[PDB]
Design an enzyme around this catalytic site. Structure first.
Site, mmCIF file in Angstrom:
data_model
loop_
_atom_site.group_PDB
_atom_site.id
_atom_site.type_symbol
_atom_site.label_atom_id
_atom_site.label_comp_id
_atom_site.label_asym_id
_atom_site.label_seq_id
_atom_site.Cartn_x
_atom_site.Cartn_y
_atom_site.Cartn_z
ATOM 1 N N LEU E 36 0.862 -1.176 0.000
ATOM 2 C CA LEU E 36 0.000 0.000 0.000
ATOM 3 C C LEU E 36 0.898 1.225 0.000
ATOM 4 O O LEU E 36 1.593 1.486 0.986
ATOM 5 C CB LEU E 36 -0.922 -0.001 1.215
ATOM 6 C CG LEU E 36 -2.260 -0.702 1.037
ATOM 7 C CD1 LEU E 36 -2.050 -2.136 0.621
ATOM 8 C CD2 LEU E 36 -3.059 -0.629 2.308
ATOM 9 N N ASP E 37 0.878 1.982 -1.090
ATOM 10 C CA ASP E 37 1.756 3.136 -1.215
ATOM 11 C C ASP E 37 1.285 4.233 -0.260
ATOM 12 O O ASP E 37 0.323 4.074 0.495
ATOM 13 C CB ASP E 37 1.812 3.607 -2.660
ATOM 14 C CG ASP E 37 0.466 4.031 -3.181
ATOM 15 O OD1 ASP E 37 -0.513 3.304 -2.915
ATOM 16 O OD2 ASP E 37 0.378 5.081 -3.855
ATOM 17 N N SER E 38 1.979 5.373 -0.292
ATOM 18 C CA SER E 38 1.800 6.390 0.737
ATOM 19 C C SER E 38 0.390 6.960 0.748
ATOM 20 O O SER E 38 -0.126 7.314 1.814
ATOM 21 C CB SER E 38 2.815 7.506 0.537
ATOM 22 O OG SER E 38 2.551 8.227 -0.651
ATOM 23 N N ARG F 50 -6.814 10.322 -7.185
ATOM 24 C CA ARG F 50 -5.619 9.490 -7.171
ATOM 25 C C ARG F 50 -5.117 9.213 -8.581
ATOM 26 O O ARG F 50 -3.907 9.087 -8.796
ATOM 27 C CB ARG F 50 -5.879 8.186 -6.430
ATOM 28 C CG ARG F 50 -4.604 7.570 -5.907
ATOM 29 C CD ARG F 50 -4.824 6.278 -5.173
ATOM 30 N NE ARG F 50 -3.564 5.553 -5.048
ATOM 31 C CZ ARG F 50 -3.447 4.274 -4.704
ATOM 32 N NH1 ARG F 50 -4.513 3.528 -4.438
ATOM 33 N NH2 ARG F 50 -2.240 3.735 -4.639
#
Ligand SMILES: CCCCCCCCCCCCCCCCCC(=O)OC[C@H](COP(=O)([O-])OCC(O)COP(=O)([O-])OC[C@@H](COC(=O)CCCCCCCCCCCCCCCCC)OC(=O)CCCCCCCCCCCCCCCCC)OC(=O)CCCCCCCCCCCCCCCCC
Ligand SMILES: CCCCCCCCCCCCCCCCCC(=O)OC[C@H](COP(=O)(O)OCCN)OC(=O)CCCCCCCCCCCCCCCCC
Ligand code: SF4
Ligand code: SF4
Lengths: 114, 100, 115, 178, 76, 114, 207
Positions: E36-38, F50
């Protein structure tokens, strides 16, 4: 002579006592330029200017003759310019403009046409 | 032009001044619409002699701008202070109508 | 019943007129025409939010002056009394009192608006 | 030279007469009766309006409106496809596509004008060396379709054959100036 | 107060909609094992700020890397 | 090499600001779908956020990142306020443009483009 | 004396050369390449770090009361690595004169702002950021002005197409003014007009 109840410019008051405020401001400029180094040019030129205008003030007491001799419009404009030159002198004391040139540009920068 | 001389009076009184002479409309005091033909004149450089374009060219008399204190070259910037011009001489108050 | 009749007639005129205005024409409804105007763009918030009023003191003193009107208004009947001196003095006093209050408000800058 | 518009020369001269005059300016709206009288004067003047379709505005021969492709008195087509009316057209409204005509003549196979790009500037007619395309007097060519305002050679020639009786006269009047 | 935070945080995690809690634990790292990236971690930290009622900066959030560190934070 | 900064000594101190901006957007989306009556769900708005962030993840110059942060703050200002309308926001989603085929043979079937 | 050409004086040239020496020797830490043209328009060129000091000098100095900002432009020249030439046209009203201060920038070498000197520079700096992409430090707002809100691009850059990358039109499917990509029914016709002959030998570039 009189008090010139209306200076034509808006937002500018009249300064019932000129020939004093100018002495204050020009003496302050002269006293602050002593902190500049000798080789600086702003020191020399501003000293010349303030000495000439101080001599003009010392010479002529009549406000109208003083204006016509001191080509800066009404006397309140001249006072505003003296305050603003003083502010500039402080700012230039902080900036040190007299130093050599920093980071001369690339060659083909101001060459025009290209 | 047709105001029956009493309505003319009414409007000239309510306004405040004679307007039958200075009207908003146009009847016959205008330049008419078909006119004679002109003969337009001819400016100089039509001299037919002693007129060479090299002598009265302006588009070629320009030069690249003069230069002072170029960092590229070795140019150098008692000496009295200087203005960009003499101070703009103050304006004189009008004479035909100074205080509107 | 004459007056009731006149008012009912005007009422029914207005309602018949609105009925015609609504059920006679044609309709093409959609959300982009039924949403508030705000000059081409969309509103940034609701209009059911506080609108600061800057003449509220003027409103309240208007209320009190309305009561003063209500007190002054019996004068046409008060003049057919036999005294005609007590009513004079009392009306004088009422009007002068109202003027004094107006002057106090004026001097204290109550008629000026809350910038 | 300059002059003041709203600067009193000097104040502080008042007597009961001037006070009465000022108090009568107030309380009678005397400087407002003058506005009422002005508007009343204007009620009794001849209005400047005109019954448009039946009587119209004054124009000059120089007026530049709908375009047209002209011909010589012999009926010969006057354009030669020199293709600079579109060089100068600052809206890029004009297109030309040209060929020899099978008579052996420099003539067009195309002359279009998007009159929704034209700015009606006159540069084309003051650039044409033969007085072929002009900007005529018709200003009453409104349409109900965008596609109608995109013209071609045939429409411009129809305009020319229509408006020659006017354009010839306008040109005769305005030349010696151009 | 302490061990309620554990299952509280863990329920927030379970509702996060992207972790698939079959792997999940309290010592579970986010970067290594879960990938899980930042930004996902930032979403998690916002979920914790929604559970509680106190804002927190990004430096603390990046010091956090697993639920146990979160629990240790809520004390201070 | 040997260049000036803007707001960032290094890339980590830029990612700090990046995450602050992502945070502001995440906290703003539910208010924008409400104030101006968008017809989307909060989930896909934040997924769009995102997406438009990961559209620029390849970058490593701190200066470019700072400028992108600046432009993101500008768009966030425009969106927090209602200076921009439903049209501009739904412009992001491309709700009318058919998908550019990312395959050879489709491009060959329609067009000479690569 | 020749009518077709423009008259010429020398006193303005000399005055402005003198004032150029003035600024050059009074402000050497920043100044480069003072120049005065055939038409007498003084033109000082400045290192970008010198912007506030130079502009404050020319505003507040007594022999230079340049306290009015007329324009604040930018000029994209893709050749030079520092593309954007930024320009400051000023006037005095005490000496009836103008001056031009110039600096340079790049996509990632921004400049300090001037609202601390000339409040008129606010919307001009906003315009320059919008049109050319020059960020200005310690500016109050620094948002777009002229471009649409949802707009990517700095149009007055020379590498930007005249017609753009997006086009608008209304769609019934979504009832919005959607933005489709660009597809014109008539390509802009680029004309190759420059003549292959040296018109002005005075500006002849040698190899
Ligand atoms: C109030 C007074 C009654 C109005 C009146 O008779 O005054 C006319 C007359 C018009 O004066 P005018 O402004 O100089 O007329 C402009 C030219 O005469 C205009 O010249 P013209 O070339 O246009 O020709 C005008 C011709 C036009 O012929 C017509 O009469 C127009 C057709 C009449 C119906 C409109 O004659 C008239 O205008 C006669 C008008 C008489 C009044 C008609 C009243 C009918 C109104 C309908 C009532 C229902 O006014 C007076 O002389 C008295 C003014 C008193 C004011 C104080
Ligand atoms: C026997 C002894 C006792 C006798 C007692 C009687 C003494 C004499 C009393 C005279 C009093 C007359 C009434 C005057 C009321 C107006 C008061 C006034 O001062 O004007 C009000 C207003 C102020 O104008 P301003 O220049 O700003 O001065 C105010 C500075 N504080 O100015 C204005 O109101 C102008 C704004 C309104 C404009 C509306 C348009 C008016 C157009 C004029 C139409 C006139 C037609 C009237 C016909 C009526 C028929 C029913
Ligand atoms: S300038 Fe005149 S002759 Fe030349 S192409 Fe245009 S219309 Fe034809
Ligand atoms: S009038 Fe001007 S804009 Fe119109 S077609 Fe002629 S050149 Fe083009």
């Amino acid at each position: 002579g009189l008090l010139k109840k209306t200076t034509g410019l808006v937002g500018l008051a009249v300064c019932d006592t000129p020939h004093e405020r100018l002495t204050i401001l020009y003496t302050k400029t002269l006293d602050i330029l002593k902190h500049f180094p000798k080789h600086a040019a702003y020191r020399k030129y501003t000293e010349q200017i303030t000495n000439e205008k101080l001599d003009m003030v010392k010479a002529e007491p009549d406000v109208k003759k003083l204006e016509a001799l001191l080509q800066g419009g009404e006397v309140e404009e001249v006072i505003l310019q003296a305050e603003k030159e003083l502010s500039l002198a402080r700012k230039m004391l902080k900036w040190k403009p007299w130093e050599p040139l920093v980071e001369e540009p690339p060659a083909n920068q101001w060459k025009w046409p290209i | 032009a047709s105001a029956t001389r009493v309505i003319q009076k009414l409007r000239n009184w309510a306004s405040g001044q004679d307007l039958q002479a200075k009207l908003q409309l146009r009847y016959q005091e205008i330049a008419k619409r078909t006119q004679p033909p002109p003969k337009l004149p001819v400016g100089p450089s039509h001299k037919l002699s002693n007129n060479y374009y090299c002598t009265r060219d302006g588009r070629r008399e320009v030069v690249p701008p003069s230069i002072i204190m170029s960092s590229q070259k070795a140019l150098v910037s008692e000496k009295k202070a200087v203005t960009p011009a003499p101070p703009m001489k103050r304006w004189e108050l009008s004479k035909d109508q100074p205080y509107l | 019943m004459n007056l009731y009749t006149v008012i009912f007639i005007n009422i029914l005129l207005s309602l018949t007129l609105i009925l015609v205005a609504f059920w006679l024409p044609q309709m093409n409804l959609y959300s982009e025409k039924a949403n508030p105007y705000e000059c081409g763009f969309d509103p940034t918030s609701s209009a059911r939010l506080p609108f600061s009023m800057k003449f509220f003191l003027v409103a309240i003193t208007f209320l009190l002056f309305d009561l003063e009107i209500a007190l002054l208004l019996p004068l046409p009947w008060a003049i057919q009394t036999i005294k005609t001196s007590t009513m004079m003095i009392m009306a004088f006093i009422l009007v002068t009192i109202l003027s004094l209050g107006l002057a106090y408000e004026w001097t204290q800058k109550g008629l000026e608006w809350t910038e | 030279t300059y002059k003041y518009v709203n600067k009193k020369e000097q104040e502080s001269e008042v007597d009961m007469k001037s006070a009465t005059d000022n108090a009568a300016r107030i309380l009678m709206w005397t400087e407002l009766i003058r506005g009422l009288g002005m508007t009343l004067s204007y009620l009794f003047r001849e209005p400047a309006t005109i019954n448009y379709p039946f009587e119209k505005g004054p124009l000059s021969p120089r007026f530049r409106g709908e375009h047209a492709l002209r011909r010589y008195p012999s009926g010969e087509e006057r354009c030669i496809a020199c293709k600079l009316c579109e060089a100068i057209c600052p809206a890029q409204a004009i297109t030309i596509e040209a060929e020899p005509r099978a008579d052996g003549s420099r003539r067009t196979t195309r002359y279009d004008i998007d009159m929704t790009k034209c700015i009606y500037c006159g540069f084309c007619q003051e650039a044409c060396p033969v007085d072929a395309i002009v900007e005529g007097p018709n200003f009453e060519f409104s349409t109900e379709t965008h596609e109608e305002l995109l013209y071609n050679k045939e429409k411009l020639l129809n305009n020319g054959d229509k408006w020659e009786a006017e354009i010839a006269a306008n040109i005769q009047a305005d030349y010696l100036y151009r | 107060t302490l061990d309620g935070i554990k299952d509280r945080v863990l329920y927030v995690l379970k509702l996060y909609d992207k972790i698939d809690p079959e792997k999940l634990s309290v010592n579970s790292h986010f970067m290594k094992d879960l990938g899980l990236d930042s930004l996902d971690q930032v979403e998690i930290i916002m979920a914790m700020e929604d559970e509680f009622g106190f804002e927190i900066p990004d430096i603390d959030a990046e010091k956090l890397m697993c639920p146990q560190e979160i629990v240790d934070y809520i004390a201070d | 090499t040997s260049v000036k900064p803007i707001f960032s000594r290094d890339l980590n101190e830029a990612k700090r600001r990046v995450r602050e901006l992502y945070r502001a957007w995440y906290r703003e989306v539910p208010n924008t779908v409400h104030l101006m009556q968008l017809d989307i769900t909060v989930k896909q708005g934040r997924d769009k956020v995102r997406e438009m962030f990961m559209k620029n993840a390849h970058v490593t110059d701190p200066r470019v990142v700072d400028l992108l942060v600046i432009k993101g703050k500008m768009e966030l200002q425009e969106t927090i306020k209602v200076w921009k309308q439903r049209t501009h926001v739904m412009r992001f989603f491309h709700e009318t443009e058919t998908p550019r085929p990312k395959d050879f043979l489709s491009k060959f079937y329609m067009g000479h483009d690569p | 004396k020749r009518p077709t050409v423009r008259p010429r004086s020398d006193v303005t040239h000399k005055q402005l050369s003198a004032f150029g020496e003035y600024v050059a020797e009074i402000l050497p830490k920043y100044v480069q390449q003072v120049q005065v043209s055939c038409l007498d328009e003084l033109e000082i060129c400045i290192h970008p770090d010198g912007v506030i000091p130079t502009l404050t000098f020319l505003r507040d100095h007594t022999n230079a009361q340049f306290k009015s900002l007329a324009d604040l432009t930018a000029v994209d020249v893709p050749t030079r690595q520092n593309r954007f030439e930024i320009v400051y046209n000023l006037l005095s009203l005490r000496f009836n004169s103008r001056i031009r201060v110039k600096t340079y920038a790049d996509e990632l070498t921004p400049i300090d702002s001037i609202v601390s000197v000339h409040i008129a520079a606010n919307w001009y700096e906003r315009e320059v950021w919008d049109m050319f992409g020059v960020f200005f430090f310690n500016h109050p707002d620094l948002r777009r002005i002229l471009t649409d809100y949802g707009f990517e691009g700095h149009p007055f850059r020379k590498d930007f197409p005249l017609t753009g990358y997006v086009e608008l039109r209304y769609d019934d499917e979504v009832k919005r003014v959607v933005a489709e990509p660009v597809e014109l029914a008539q390509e802009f016709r680029k004309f190759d007009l420059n003549s292959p002959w040296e018109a002005f030998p005075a500006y002849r570039q040698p190899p």
